[PDB]
Amino acid sequence: PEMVRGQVFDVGPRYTNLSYIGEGAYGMVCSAYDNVNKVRVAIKKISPFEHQTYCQRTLREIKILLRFRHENIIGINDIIRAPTIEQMKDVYIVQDLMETDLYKLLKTQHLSNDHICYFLYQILRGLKYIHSANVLHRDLKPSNLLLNTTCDLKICDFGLARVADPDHDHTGFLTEYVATRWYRAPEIMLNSKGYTKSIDIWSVGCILAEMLSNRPIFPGKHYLDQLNHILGILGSPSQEDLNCIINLKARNYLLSLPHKNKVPWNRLFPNADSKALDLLDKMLTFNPHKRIEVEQALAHPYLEQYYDPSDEPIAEAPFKFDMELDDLPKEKLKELIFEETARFQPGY
Ligand SMILES: Cc1cnc(Nc2ccc(F)cc2Cl)nc1-c1c[nH]c(C(=O)N[C@H](CO)c2cccc(Cl)c2)c1
Ligand SMILES: [Cl-]
Ligand SMILES: [Cl-]
């Protein structure tokens, strides 16, 4: 069995000749040659079974991606794991291979306005599909946007994805959050669990800023500093916006800050298309209730060359989990993962 940077990848004899691509909190992704289909593929090894949270994320990603089918979303073509639940330590998810990601691209290249616009279009086209299933991605960022040399874009990494739940979005001030700091909407630090579609739109706004400028727009150093950097551009929230924040520790925190001016977008982005900056303004709205929605963003003038509902598929119906995963033990979740991956086993 082959090994890459200390990880064994027990995926032969069908898949061979592996190279490293990247890693995650409980695994590694490699490229591999598929000896059946005579093509190179991506294989993501995950090893989640010692942690309840990792098992939950694994099951959600698998269930969601096996259900979804869309040009701008990564799929799952095969899943490898051991013949019996006792021998299963790892799961290998086989996916279409892409060439790079937007994080890497932006380290080397300043994008043209036309490339920015096309990439934004694809992000939102994929997100329109995800949201139409009442699913949230919850970790959109450049390194989760895969690309090829023909500028096709796929969203990947659904480990934090879940079904939207506005009724349970509320939480206390300074509640822990798992998704990447720089892409967190201001409400995460105030009163939100990120259980509404507005959470993803903020992240897309942050990505757009980064495509415009090759800089993260809000590079917080720590959890609370993230909010202060957001306010460094948006300025102090309006009274209307403040009145929407009920929980007092959050409200009192905001009231304790010095007043901050709103910094005009054209100062940050002097060479940007004005229409892109108008859309950016609407995506990066402080109040999540007032923030632009995915179809509205697609319908914005900046995207007029591309927007075409007759070429933007949606999901058949809302995605639905059959059971509450939040409170299941890791051995129960393992049983569920075993079951979910059974149809890829030889025989079945
Ligand atoms: C599915 C896929 C398909 N093609 C490419 N290619 C690629 C992407 C970036 C590169 F720098 C180079 C290449 Cl070749 N990457 C991927 C890919 C990139 N990231 C992931 C991916 O799912 N990454 C997540 C972390 O965000 C991950 C990874 C391992 C374990 C865990 Cl727990 C989580 C897949
Ligand atoms: Cl902090
Ligand atoms: Cl509140």
For residue 48, the ligand 1 atom closest to its alpha carbon is 32
The DSSP 8-state label assigned to residue 25 in this structure reads T
Q: How far apart are CA 199 and CA 301, in angstroms?
A: 22
Binding site annotation covers 320? no
Assess whether the C-beta atom of 32 lies below 6 angstroms from ligand 1: no
Alpha-carbon gap, residue 154 to 70, rounded angstroms: 9
Say yes or no: CB of residue 58 within 6 Å of ligand 1: no
Experimental technique used to determine this entry: X-ray
- Measured from the Cα of 156, ligand 1's closest atom is 22
Kindly state if the Cβ of 25 falls inside 6 Å of ligand 1.
yes
Burial 303-313 (b: 16+ CB within 10 A, else e): beebbeeeebe
Q: Resolution, rounded to a tenth of an Å?
A: 1.5
List CB-based neighbours of ion ligand 2 within 5 Å: 222-224
Q: Please give the positions annotated as active site.
A: 139
23 lines ligand 1 (CB under 6 A): yes
Q: What is d(CA 142, CA 262) in angstroms, rounded to the nearest whole number?
A: 26
24 lines ligand 1 (CB under 6 A): yes
CA of 227 to the centre of ligand 2 (A): 9
Q: Regarding beta strands 7-9 and 39-46, do their DSSP bridges make them parallel or antiparallel, or are they unpaired?
A: unpaired
Q: How far apart are CA 307 and CA 51, in angstroms?
A: 42
Name all domains of the chain by residue range, CATH numbers in brackets.
Answer: 1-97+327-348 (3.30.200.20), 98-326 (1.10.510.10)
Query: What's the rounded Cα separation, in Å, for the pair 201 and 150?
Result: 25
| Annotated binding-site residue? 22 | yes
Q: Nearest CA to 199 among 280, 288, 314, 295?
A: 288
Taking CA atoms only, the protein residue closest to ligand 1 atom 10 is: 100
- Determine phi and psi for 7, rounding to 5 degrees: -95, 120
CA distance 25 to 316: 32
In angstroms, what is the span from residue 218 Cα to ligand 2's centroid?
Answer: 14
Please check whether residue 208 is in contact with residue 217, taking contact to mean a CB–CB distance below 8 angstroms: no
Residue owning the nearest CA to atom 7 of ligand 1: 100
Please name the residue ranges forming H helices in 2-101. 52-67
CA of 244 to the centre of ligand 3 (A): 7
The answer to whether residues 33 and 11 touch, using CB atoms and an 8 Å cutoff, is no
CA gap 13, 335 in Å, rounded: 26
Would you tell me the crossing angle of helices 198-213 and 113-132 to the nearest 10 degrees? Answer: 170
SS3 content of the chain, % helix, strand, coil (to 5): 40, 15, 45
Atom number of ligand 1 nearest to Cα 31: 14
Crossing angle between the packed helical segments 52-67 and 330-340, to the nearest 10 degrees: 20
Judged by phi (left if over 0) then psi (alpha if -120 to 50, else beta), residue 98 lies in beta
Helical spans, DSSP H, in 263-325: 265-268, 274-283, 294-298
Tell me how far the alpha carbon of residue 190 lies from the centroid of ligand 2, in angstroms.
13
28 Cβ below 6 A of ligand 1: yes
Measured distance CA(239)–CA(291) in Å, rounded: 17
CA distances from 60 to 24, 43, 63, 109, 325 (A): 16, 18, 5, 34, 9
**Cα angle vertex 152, ends 147, 157, to 5°?**
50
- The label of the residue with tokens 């070429």 reads 311
Q: Contacts for 100-105 with beta carbons within 8 Å, 24 or more apart?
A: 100/146, 100/147, 100/148, 101/142, 101/143, 101/144, 101/145, 101/146, 101/147, 102/142, 102/143, 102/145, 102/147, 102/153, 102/207, 102/211, 103/141, 103/142, 103/143, 103/145, 104/143, 105/142, 105/147
The 10 Å Cβ neighbour count of residue 340 is: 16
Range list of β-strands (E), the chain? 2-4, 7-9, 15-24, 27-34, 39-46, 78-80, 91-96, 100-101, 135-136, 145-147, 153-155, 162-163
